[PDB]
Design a protein around this ligand. Sequence first.
Ligand code: HEM
Ligand SMILES: Cc1cc(Br)ccc1O
Length: 137
Amino acid sequence: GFKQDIATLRGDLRTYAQDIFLAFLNKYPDEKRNFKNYVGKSDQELKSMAKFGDHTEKVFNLMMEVADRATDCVPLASDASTLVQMKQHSGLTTGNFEKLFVALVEYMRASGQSFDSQSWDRFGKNLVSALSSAGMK
Ligand code: HEM
Ligand SMILES: Cc1cc(Br)ccc1O
């Protein structure tokens, strides 16, 4: 289930962080509006870029903490307020988060691995709700 998936993802975290983020940017190319230094790059070029690998892993490190602190795929209010109040997220709306979670769920459903895609879909939904409650437009 969900707790085991958190373990799986952490066991190859820099590969999953990069592959899921690329799945997101390829499925929703207009999202590069928020990531102007990743324009005009292939997947392999982004994987060679220091900022890409370090950004994606730090993002994914925190996402897994938020997932792990959740109960029944509902994140803590303290984690949602962190994500809302982060200067880095100044320009974001919940739609940005929804799209990331659609991309993650479709990644999991396309893998041959027994990921609990329904729990991740729920988590993404619940996180979007928590971000709204914590002040995200
Ligand atoms: C659960 C979801 C997310 C978590 C846990 C999270 C976490 C983080 C963290 C830890 C950083 C700092 C990274 C660093 O400085 O190395 C960060 C920066 C940033 N995040 Fe998020 N983030 C989330 C979702 C998103 C989404 C959906 C967007 C936009 C679609 C976004 C846009 C950014 C941007 C633009 C930055 C700074 C510049 C850069 O990306 O390199 N984040 N986020
Ligand atoms: C939105 C997002 C998701 C992942 Br996974 C890695 C980096 C990033 O900015």
